[PDB]
Amino acid sequence: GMLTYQVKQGDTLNSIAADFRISTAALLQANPSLQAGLTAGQSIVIPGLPDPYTIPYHIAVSIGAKTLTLSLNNRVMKTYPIAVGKILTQTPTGEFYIINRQRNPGGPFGAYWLSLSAAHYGIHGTNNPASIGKAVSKGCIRMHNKDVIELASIVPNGTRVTINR
Amino acid sequence: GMLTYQVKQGDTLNSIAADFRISTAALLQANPSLQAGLTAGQSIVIPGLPDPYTIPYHIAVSIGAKTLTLSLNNRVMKTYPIAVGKILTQTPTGEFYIINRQRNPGGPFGAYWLSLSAAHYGIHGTNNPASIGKAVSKGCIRMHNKDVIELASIVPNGTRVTINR
């Protein structure tokens, strides 16, 4: 399957490529008609990723509640506490996807890193358990190591992540 | 030209791929003999990157002094103040390379992002000028926007970055 991305106002070819961890050239190859530039509201294909819309899992993040809630077909399966971004470095809101992952990243990333479709952002573990449940991050979503391990064992790449205030 | 990487103790195929923002498959293709695994101290090729050793620029970072010093053939050309990592999220030390860049990343990244060859780390600008000169970062090296713009205009991808305490 293919992932379809809805172009947003402000997006540039450069910024979309960075968000999905790909080259503008690869983005252009998968969408030859982009040879004439971008348009807000149009849909385009992101090469190399699975179809998010066949995946029955969905993740909902509440910045205010400091929770990440995993659902399977509208049924809530898990709820985890999280750290979110501080005021000058907030966690971004909107519709995103998990696009890749790295086991054992270590350092502040703890036991697992899951990339989100915003450049430089992800869901990860932590070396500072006291930080969980607080707005103290650079923007990434932090989880207890045991929790990010469990989350990663359940959801595949392509999984939708919706982030709300 | 080709970039040659010196395998370090602790490196895995997964971790090297992540550090250089590539797939293990691509890493394996560029180094067919790795089909038998890794060995600390051996040298391997990282595909798709320029040769760092033809570039006459060299960047030296001092965590203690909070400086980034740019040299051209052993002659110091610029010295900039920087923010570095706090105690639980320190800036890593060792030999790295600038491997790609993104203009206008915005948010905490400010005017420019330059990727370093350690997964998730880079040199970037800032939306918080007061942070420069302090050990308050997640590990990335922060610069004043005007300074990262200037640095990026001078040095090419592949440029060596040596980080010392």
Short mmCIF file of all heavy atoms in Angstrom, two decimals, chain A residues 6-71:
data_model
loop_
_atom_site.label_atom_id
_atom_site.label_comp_id
_atom_site.label_asym_id
_atom_site.label_seq_id
_atom_site.Cartn_x
_atom_site.Cartn_y
_atom_site.Cartn_z
N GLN A 6 -1.73 14.85 3.00
CA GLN A 6 -2.47 16.08 2.70
C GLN A 6 -1.58 17.32 2.93
O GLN A 6 -1.23 17.64 4.07
CB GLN A 6 -3.73 16.16 3.58
CG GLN A 6 -4.55 14.86 3.60
CD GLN A 6 -4.88 14.39 2.21
OE1 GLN A 6 -5.10 15.21 1.32
NE2 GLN A 6 -4.90 13.08 2.01
N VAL A 7 -1.22 18.00 1.84
CA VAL A 7 -0.36 19.18 1.91
C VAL A 7 -1.02 20.27 2.73
O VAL A 7 -2.21 20.57 2.56
CB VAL A 7 -0.03 19.76 0.50
CG1 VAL A 7 0.63 21.14 0.62
CG2 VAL A 7 0.85 18.80 -0.30
N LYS A 8 -0.25 20.88 3.61
CA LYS A 8 -0.77 21.91 4.49
C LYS A 8 -0.23 23.27 4.06
O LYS A 8 0.80 23.37 3.39
CB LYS A 8 -0.40 21.59 5.94
CG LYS A 8 -1.08 20.33 6.45
CD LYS A 8 -0.22 19.61 7.48
CE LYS A 8 -0.94 18.36 8.00
NZ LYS A 8 -1.28 17.39 6.92
N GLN A 9 -0.96 24.32 4.42
CA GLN A 9 -0.50 25.66 4.14
C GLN A 9 0.80 25.87 4.91
O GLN A 9 0.87 25.60 6.11
CB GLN A 9 -1.55 26.70 4.52
CG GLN A 9 -1.30 28.06 3.90
CD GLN A 9 -0.73 27.95 2.49
OE1 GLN A 9 0.49 27.91 2.30
NE2 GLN A 9 -1.61 27.90 1.50
N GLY A 10 1.83 26.32 4.20
CA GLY A 10 3.13 26.52 4.82
C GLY A 10 4.12 25.47 4.38
O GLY A 10 5.32 25.73 4.32
N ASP A 11 3.63 24.28 4.07
CA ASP A 11 4.50 23.22 3.57
C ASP A 11 5.25 23.70 2.34
O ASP A 11 4.73 24.45 1.51
CB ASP A 11 3.69 21.98 3.17
CG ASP A 11 3.25 21.16 4.36
OD1 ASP A 11 3.70 21.42 5.49
OD2 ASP A 11 2.44 20.23 4.14
N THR A 12 6.49 23.25 2.24
CA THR A 12 7.33 23.43 1.08
C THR A 12 7.81 22.04 0.73
O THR A 12 7.64 21.11 1.52
CB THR A 12 8.56 24.30 1.40
OG1 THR A 12 9.39 23.63 2.36
CG2 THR A 12 8.11 25.64 1.97
N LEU A 13 8.39 21.87 -0.45
CA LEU A 13 8.90 20.56 -0.83
C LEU A 13 9.99 20.14 0.14
O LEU A 13 10.07 18.98 0.55
CB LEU A 13 9.43 20.57 -2.27
CG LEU A 13 8.39 20.83 -3.36
CD1 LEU A 13 9.05 21.21 -4.68
CD2 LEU A 13 7.50 19.61 -3.54
N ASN A 14 10.83 21.09 0.52
CA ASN A 14 11.89 20.84 1.49
C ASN A 14 11.36 20.37 2.84
O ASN A 14 11.88 19.43 3.44
CB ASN A 14 12.77 22.08 1.67
CG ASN A 14 13.69 22.34 0.48
OD1 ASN A 14 14.13 21.40 -0.19
ND2 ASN A 14 14.00 23.61 0.23
N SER A 15 10.32 21.04 3.34
CA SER A 15 9.83 20.74 4.68
C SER A 15 9.12 19.39 4.72
O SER A 15 9.22 18.67 5.72
CB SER A 15 8.93 21.86 5.21
OG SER A 15 7.72 21.92 4.48
N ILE A 16 8.43 19.03 3.64
CA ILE A 16 7.73 17.74 3.61
C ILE A 16 8.75 16.61 3.58
O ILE A 16 8.62 15.61 4.29
CB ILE A 16 6.77 17.65 2.41
CG1 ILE A 16 5.64 18.68 2.57
CG2 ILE A 16 6.19 16.22 2.27
CD1 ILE A 16 4.70 18.82 1.33
N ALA A 17 9.77 16.76 2.74
CA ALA A 17 10.83 15.77 2.67
C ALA A 17 11.46 15.55 4.05
O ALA A 17 11.66 14.41 4.47
CB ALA A 17 11.87 16.17 1.65
N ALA A 18 11.76 16.65 4.75
CA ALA A 18 12.36 16.56 6.09
C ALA A 18 11.43 15.89 7.09
O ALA A 18 11.88 15.11 7.94
CB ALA A 18 12.76 17.95 6.58
N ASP A 19 10.14 16.20 7.01
CA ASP A 19 9.17 15.60 7.92
C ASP A 19 9.12 14.09 7.75
O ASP A 19 8.92 13.36 8.71
CB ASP A 19 7.77 16.19 7.72
CG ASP A 19 7.64 17.60 8.28
OD1 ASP A 19 8.46 17.98 9.14
OD2 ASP A 19 6.71 18.32 7.84
N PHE A 20 9.29 13.62 6.52
CA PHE A 20 9.16 12.18 6.28
C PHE A 20 10.51 11.48 6.15
O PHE A 20 10.57 10.31 5.81
CB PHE A 20 8.25 11.89 5.08
CG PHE A 20 6.79 12.09 5.40
CD1 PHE A 20 6.17 13.30 5.12
CD2 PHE A 20 6.05 11.09 6.00
CE1 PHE A 20 4.82 13.50 5.43
CE2 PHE A 20 4.71 11.28 6.30
CZ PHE A 20 4.10 12.49 6.02
N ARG A 21 11.58 12.22 6.45
CA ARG A 21 12.94 11.68 6.48
C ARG A 21 13.39 11.21 5.10
O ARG A 21 14.10 10.21 5.00
CB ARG A 21 13.04 10.52 7.49
CG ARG A 21 12.29 10.71 8.84
CD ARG A 21 12.83 11.89 9.63
NE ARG A 21 12.61 11.78 11.08
CZ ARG A 21 11.57 12.30 11.73
NH1 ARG A 21 10.62 12.94 11.06
NH2 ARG A 21 11.46 12.17 13.05
N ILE A 22 13.00 11.92 4.04
CA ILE A 22 13.36 11.55 2.66
C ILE A 22 13.93 12.74 1.89
O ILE A 22 13.91 13.87 2.38
CB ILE A 22 12.15 10.97 1.84
CG1 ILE A 22 11.03 12.01 1.71
CG2 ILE A 22 11.63 9.69 2.47
CD1 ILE A 22 9.89 11.57 0.74
N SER A 23 14.43 12.48 0.68
CA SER A 23 14.97 13.54 -0.17
C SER A 23 13.86 14.18 -0.99
O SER A 23 12.86 13.53 -1.30
CB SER A 23 16.02 12.97 -1.12
OG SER A 23 15.41 12.10 -2.07
N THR A 24 14.04 15.45 -1.35
CA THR A 24 13.06 16.09 -2.22
C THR A 24 13.01 15.38 -3.57
O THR A 24 11.96 15.29 -4.20
CB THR A 24 13.33 17.61 -2.39
OG1 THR A 24 14.66 17.81 -2.89
CG2 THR A 24 13.18 18.33 -1.06
N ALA A 25 14.16 14.86 -4.00
CA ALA A 25 14.24 14.11 -5.26
C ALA A 25 13.35 12.86 -5.25
O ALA A 25 12.66 12.57 -6.22
CB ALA A 25 15.68 13.75 -5.58
N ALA A 26 13.39 12.13 -4.13
CA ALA A 26 12.55 10.94 -3.98
C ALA A 26 11.08 11.33 -3.93
O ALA A 26 10.23 10.67 -4.53
CB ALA A 26 12.94 10.18 -2.72
N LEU A 27 10.78 12.41 -3.22
CA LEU A 27 9.43 12.95 -3.17
C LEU A 27 8.96 13.34 -4.57
O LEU A 27 7.83 13.04 -4.96
CB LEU A 27 9.38 14.16 -2.22
CG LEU A 27 8.02 14.74 -1.87
CD1 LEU A 27 7.12 13.66 -1.26
CD2 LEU A 27 8.20 15.91 -0.92
N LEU A 28 9.83 13.98 -5.35
CA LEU A 28 9.49 14.37 -6.72
C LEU A 28 9.30 13.18 -7.65
O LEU A 28 8.45 13.22 -8.54
CB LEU A 28 10.56 15.31 -7.30
CG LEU A 28 10.39 16.79 -6.96
CD1 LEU A 28 11.37 17.61 -7.77
CD2 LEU A 28 8.97 17.24 -7.23
N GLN A 29 10.10 12.13 -7.46
CA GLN A 29 9.97 10.94 -8.29
C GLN A 29 8.63 10.25 -8.08
O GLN A 29 8.01 9.77 -9.02
CB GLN A 29 11.11 9.97 -8.01
CG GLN A 29 11.00 8.68 -8.80
CD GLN A 29 12.04 7.66 -8.40
OE1 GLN A 29 12.84 7.90 -7.49
NE2 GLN A 29 12.04 6.52 -9.07
N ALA A 30 8.19 10.19 -6.83
CA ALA A 30 6.94 9.53 -6.48
C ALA A 30 5.73 10.35 -6.91
O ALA A 30 4.61 9.86 -6.92
CB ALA A 30 6.89 9.28 -4.97
N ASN A 31 5.98 11.61 -7.26
CA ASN A 31 4.94 12.55 -7.64
C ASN A 31 5.44 13.44 -8.77
O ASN A 31 5.73 14.61 -8.54
CB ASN A 31 4.57 13.45 -6.46
CG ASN A 31 4.05 12.69 -5.27
OD1 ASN A 31 2.85 12.40 -5.19
ND2 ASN A 31 4.94 12.38 -4.32
N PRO A 32 5.55 12.89 -9.98
CA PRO A 32 6.12 13.63 -11.11
C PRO A 32 5.45 14.99 -11.36
O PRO A 32 6.12 15.93 -11.78
CB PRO A 32 5.87 12.70 -12.30
CG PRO A 32 5.90 11.34 -11.69
CD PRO A 32 5.25 11.49 -10.33
N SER A 33 4.15 15.09 -11.09
CA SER A 33 3.42 16.32 -11.35
C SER A 33 3.85 17.47 -10.43
O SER A 33 3.50 18.63 -10.68
CB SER A 33 1.92 16.09 -11.24
OG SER A 33 1.52 15.94 -9.89
N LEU A 34 4.59 17.16 -9.37
CA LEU A 34 5.07 18.21 -8.46
C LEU A 34 6.15 19.05 -9.13
O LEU A 34 6.59 20.06 -8.57
CB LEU A 34 5.61 17.60 -7.16
CG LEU A 34 4.57 17.05 -6.20
CD1 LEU A 34 5.24 16.58 -4.93
CD2 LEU A 34 3.51 18.09 -5.90
N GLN A 35 6.56 18.63 -10.32
CA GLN A 35 7.52 19.36 -11.13
C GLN A 35 7.04 20.79 -11.38
O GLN A 35 7.77 21.63 -11.91
CB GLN A 35 7.74 18.64 -12.46
CG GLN A 35 8.90 19.19 -13.27
CD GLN A 35 10.22 19.09 -12.53
OE1 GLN A 35 10.37 18.28 -11.62
NE2 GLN A 35 11.18 19.92 -12.93
N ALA A 36 5.80 21.07 -10.99
CA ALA A 36 5.22 22.40 -11.13
C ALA A 36 4.92 23.04 -9.78
O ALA A 36 4.20 24.03 -9.70
CB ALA A 36 3.96 22.33 -11.98
N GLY A 37 5.48 22.47 -8.71
CA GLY A 37 5.34 23.04 -7.38
C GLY A 37 4.17 22.49 -6.58
O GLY A 37 3.46 21.59 -7.04
N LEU A 38 3.96 23.04 -5.39
CA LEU A 38 2.95 22.55 -4.45
C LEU A 38 1.71 23.43 -4.36
O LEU A 38 1.73 24.60 -4.74
CB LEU A 38 3.55 22.43 -3.05
CG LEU A 38 4.57 21.32 -2.78
CD1 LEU A 38 5.19 21.52 -1.41
CD2 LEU A 38 3.91 19.96 -2.89
N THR A 39 0.63 22.85 -3.84
CA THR A 39 -0.62 23.57 -3.61
C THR A 39 -1.27 23.09 -2.32
O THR A 39 -1.50 21.89 -2.15
CB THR A 39 -1.62 23.32 -4.77
OG1 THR A 39 -0.95 23.46 -6.03
CG2 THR A 39 -2.79 24.30 -4.69
N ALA A 40 -1.57 24.00 -1.40
CA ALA A 40 -2.22 23.60 -0.15
C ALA A 40 -3.53 22.87 -0.42
O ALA A 40 -4.33 23.31 -1.25
CB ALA A 40 -2.44 24.80 0.76
N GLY A 41 -3.76 21.77 0.29
CA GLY A 41 -4.99 21.01 0.14
C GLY A 41 -4.90 19.83 -0.82
O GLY A 41 -5.73 18.91 -0.75
N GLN A 42 -3.93 19.85 -1.72
CA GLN A 42 -3.75 18.73 -2.62
C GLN A 42 -3.16 17.54 -1.85
O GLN A 42 -2.53 17.71 -0.80
CB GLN A 42 -2.85 19.09 -3.80
CG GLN A 42 -1.36 19.04 -3.50
CD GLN A 42 -0.51 19.41 -4.71
OE1 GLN A 42 0.21 20.42 -4.70
NE2 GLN A 42 -0.57 18.59 -5.76
N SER A 43 -3.39 16.34 -2.38
CA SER A 43 -2.85 15.12 -1.78
C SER A 43 -1.70 14.58 -2.63
O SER A 43 -1.75 14.65 -3.86
CB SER A 43 -3.95 14.06 -1.65
OG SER A 43 -5.13 14.59 -1.05
N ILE A 44 -0.67 14.07 -1.97
CA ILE A 44 0.51 13.49 -2.64
C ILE A 44 0.92 12.19 -1.95
O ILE A 44 0.50 11.92 -0.83
CB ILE A 44 1.71 14.46 -2.63
CG1 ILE A 44 2.21 14.69 -1.19
CG2 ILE A 44 1.36 15.77 -3.31
CD1 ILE A 44 3.53 15.46 -1.11
N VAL A 45 1.73 11.39 -2.64
CA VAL A 45 2.20 10.12 -2.10
C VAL A 45 3.57 10.27 -1.43
O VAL A 45 4.46 10.95 -1.94
CB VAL A 45 2.31 9.05 -3.21
CG1 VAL A 45 3.05 7.82 -2.70
CG2 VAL A 45 0.93 8.69 -3.74
N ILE A 46 3.74 9.63 -0.27
CA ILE A 46 5.05 9.60 0.37
C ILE A 46 5.63 8.22 0.12
O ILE A 46 5.09 7.22 0.58
CB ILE A 46 5.00 9.89 1.88
CG1 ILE A 46 4.25 11.19 2.16
CG2 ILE A 46 6.44 9.94 2.44
CD1 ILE A 46 4.89 12.43 1.55
N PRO A 47 6.74 8.16 -0.63
CA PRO A 47 7.26 6.84 -1.01
C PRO A 47 7.84 6.06 0.16
O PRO A 47 8.38 6.63 1.11
CB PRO A 47 8.36 7.18 -2.02
CG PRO A 47 8.82 8.55 -1.62
CD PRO A 47 7.57 9.26 -1.15
N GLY A 48 7.71 4.74 0.08
CA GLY A 48 8.41 3.86 0.99
C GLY A 48 7.71 3.56 2.30
O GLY A 48 8.23 2.78 3.10
N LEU A 49 6.55 4.16 2.52
CA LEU A 49 5.80 3.95 3.76
C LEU A 49 4.52 3.14 3.54
O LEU A 49 3.94 3.18 2.45
CB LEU A 49 5.44 5.29 4.40
CG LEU A 49 6.67 6.04 4.90
CD1 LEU A 49 6.32 7.47 5.31
CD2 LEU A 49 7.33 5.29 6.06
N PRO A 50 4.07 2.43 4.58
CA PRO A 50 2.85 1.62 4.51
C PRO A 50 1.60 2.49 4.58
O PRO A 50 1.69 3.64 4.98
CB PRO A 50 2.93 0.74 5.75
CG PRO A 50 3.82 1.49 6.69
CD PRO A 50 4.77 2.27 5.87
N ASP A 51 0.45 1.93 4.19
CA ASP A 51 -0.81 2.65 4.23
C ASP A 51 -1.36 2.77 5.66
O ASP A 51 -1.74 1.76 6.26
CB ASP A 51 -1.82 1.89 3.37
CG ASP A 51 -3.11 2.68 3.12
OD1 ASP A 51 -3.41 3.65 3.84
OD2 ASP A 51 -3.82 2.31 2.16
N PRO A 52 -1.43 3.99 6.21
CA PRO A 52 -1.93 4.15 7.58
C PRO A 52 -3.38 3.71 7.73
O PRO A 52 -3.81 3.33 8.82
CB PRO A 52 -1.82 5.66 7.82
CG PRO A 52 -0.69 6.08 6.96
CD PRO A 52 -0.87 5.26 5.70
N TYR A 53 -4.13 3.77 6.64
CA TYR A 53 -5.56 3.57 6.73
C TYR A 53 -6.03 2.10 6.70
O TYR A 53 -7.23 1.84 6.81
CB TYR A 53 -6.29 4.47 5.73
CG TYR A 53 -6.34 5.88 6.28
CD1 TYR A 53 -5.23 6.72 6.20
CD2 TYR A 53 -7.45 6.32 6.98
CE1 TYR A 53 -5.26 8.00 6.75
CE2 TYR A 53 -7.49 7.59 7.53
CZ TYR A 53 -6.39 8.42 7.41
OH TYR A 53 -6.45 9.69 7.97
N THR A 54 -5.10 1.16 6.56
CA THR A 54 -5.44 -0.25 6.76
C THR A 54 -5.10 -0.72 8.18
O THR A 54 -5.39 -1.86 8.53
CB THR A 54 -4.74 -1.20 5.76
OG1 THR A 54 -3.32 -1.06 5.88
CG2 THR A 54 -5.19 -0.88 4.33
N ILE A 55 -4.47 0.16 8.97
CA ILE A 55 -4.02 -0.20 10.31
C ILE A 55 -5.13 0.11 11.30
O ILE A 55 -5.60 1.25 11.36
CB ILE A 55 -2.73 0.58 10.70
CG1 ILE A 55 -1.58 0.19 9.77
CG2 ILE A 55 -2.36 0.35 12.19
CD1 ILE A 55 -0.38 1.14 9.85
N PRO A 56 -5.58 -0.90 12.06
CA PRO A 56 -6.74 -0.69 12.94
C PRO A 56 -6.38 0.01 14.24
O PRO A 56 -7.28 0.45 14.95
CB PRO A 56 -7.23 -2.12 13.21
CG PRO A 56 -6.02 -2.95 13.13
CD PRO A 56 -5.12 -2.30 12.09
N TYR A 57 -5.09 0.13 14.53
CA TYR A 57 -4.65 0.89 15.69
C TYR A 57 -4.64 2.39 15.43
O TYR A 57 -4.38 2.84 14.31
CB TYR A 57 -3.25 0.44 16.13
CG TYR A 57 -3.23 -0.98 16.63
CD1 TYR A 57 -2.70 -2.00 15.85
CD2 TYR A 57 -3.75 -1.30 17.87
CE1 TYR A 57 -2.68 -3.31 16.31
CE2 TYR A 57 -3.74 -2.60 18.33
CZ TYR A 57 -3.20 -3.60 17.55
OH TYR A 57 -3.20 -4.89 18.03
N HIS A 58 -4.90 3.16 16.48
CA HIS A 58 -4.85 4.62 16.40
C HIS A 58 -4.39 5.14 17.75
O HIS A 58 -4.84 4.67 18.80
CB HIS A 58 -6.23 5.18 16.04
CG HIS A 58 -6.21 6.63 15.65
ND1 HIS A 58 -7.16 7.19 14.82
CD2 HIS A 58 -5.35 7.63 15.97
CE1 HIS A 58 -6.89 8.47 14.65
NE2 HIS A 58 -5.80 8.76 15.34
N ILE A 59 -3.48 6.11 17.73
CA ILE A 59 -2.95 6.68 18.96
C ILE A 59 -3.46 8.10 19.12
O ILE A 59 -3.45 8.89 18.17
CB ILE A 59 -1.41 6.69 18.93
CG1 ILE A 59 -0.86 5.26 18.96
CG2 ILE A 59 -0.84 7.49 20.09
CD1 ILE A 59 0.62 5.15 18.63
N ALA A 60 -3.95 8.44 20.32
CA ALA A 60 -4.40 9.79 20.61
C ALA A 60 -3.58 10.36 21.76
O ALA A 60 -3.47 9.75 22.82
CB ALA A 60 -5.89 9.80 20.95
N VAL A 61 -3.00 11.54 21.55
CA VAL A 61 -2.19 12.19 22.58
C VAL A 61 -2.88 13.46 23.06
O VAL A 61 -3.30 14.29 22.26
CB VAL A 61 -0.80 12.57 22.05
CG1 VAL A 61 -0.02 13.39 23.10
CG2 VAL A 61 -0.03 11.32 21.68
N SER A 62 -3.01 13.59 24.38
CA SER A 62 -3.53 14.82 24.97
C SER A 62 -2.43 15.54 25.72
O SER A 62 -1.90 15.03 26.70
CB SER A 62 -4.69 14.52 25.92
OG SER A 62 -5.07 15.71 26.60
N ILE A 63 -2.07 16.73 25.24
CA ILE A 63 -1.02 17.51 25.88
C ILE A 63 -1.47 17.93 27.27
O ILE A 63 -0.70 17.87 28.23
CB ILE A 63 -0.64 18.73 25.04
CG1 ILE A 63 -0.03 18.27 23.71
CG2 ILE A 63 0.34 19.64 25.77
CD1 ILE A 63 0.35 19.41 22.80
N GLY A 64 -2.72 18.36 27.37
CA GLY A 64 -3.27 18.82 28.63
C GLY A 64 -3.34 17.72 29.68
O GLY A 64 -2.94 17.92 30.83
N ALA A 65 -3.86 16.57 29.28
CA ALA A 65 -4.01 15.45 30.20
C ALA A 65 -2.70 14.69 30.43
O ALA A 65 -2.61 13.88 31.36
CB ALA A 65 -5.09 14.49 29.71
N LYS A 66 -1.70 14.95 29.59
CA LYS A 66 -0.42 14.23 29.64
C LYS A 66 -0.63 12.72 29.48
O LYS A 66 -0.07 11.92 30.24
CB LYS A 66 0.33 14.50 30.95
CG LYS A 66 0.44 15.96 31.34
CD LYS A 66 1.46 16.70 30.52
CE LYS A 66 1.66 18.12 31.05
NZ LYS A 66 0.39 18.91 31.01
N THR A 67 -1.42 12.34 28.48
CA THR A 67 -1.68 10.94 28.22
C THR A 67 -1.46 10.59 26.76
O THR A 67 -1.61 11.43 25.87
CB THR A 67 -3.12 10.54 28.59
OG1 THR A 67 -4.04 11.43 27.95
CG2 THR A 67 -3.33 10.59 30.10
N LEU A 68 -1.08 9.33 26.54
CA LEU A 68 -1.10 8.74 25.21
C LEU A 68 -2.04 7.53 25.29
O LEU A 68 -1.84 6.63 26.10
CB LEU A 68 0.31 8.31 24.79
CG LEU A 68 0.51 7.71 23.39
CD1 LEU A 68 1.92 7.97 22.88
CD2 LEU A 68 0.20 6.22 23.39
N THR A 69 -3.09 7.55 24.47
CA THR A 69 -4.13 6.53 24.50
C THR A 69 -4.12 5.72 23.21
O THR A 69 -4.25 6.27 22.10
CB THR A 69 -5.53 7.18 24.70
OG1 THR A 69 -5.53 7.95 25.91
CG2 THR A 69 -6.63 6.12 24.78
N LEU A 70 -3.94 4.41 23.34
CA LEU A 70 -3.91 3.51 22.20
C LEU A 70 -5.27 2.85 22.03
O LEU A 70 -5.81 2.28 22.98
CB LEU A 70 -2.84 2.44 22.39
CG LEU A 70 -2.84 1.33 21.34
CD1 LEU A 70 -2.53 1.89 19.95
CD2 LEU A 70 -1.85 0.24 21.72
N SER A 71 -5.83 2.95 20.83
CA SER A 71 -7.12 2.33 20.54
C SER A 71 -6.98 1.31 19.42
O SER A 71 -6.11 1.43 18.56
CB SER A 71 -8.16 3.39 20.14
OG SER A 71 -8.46 4.24 21.23
#
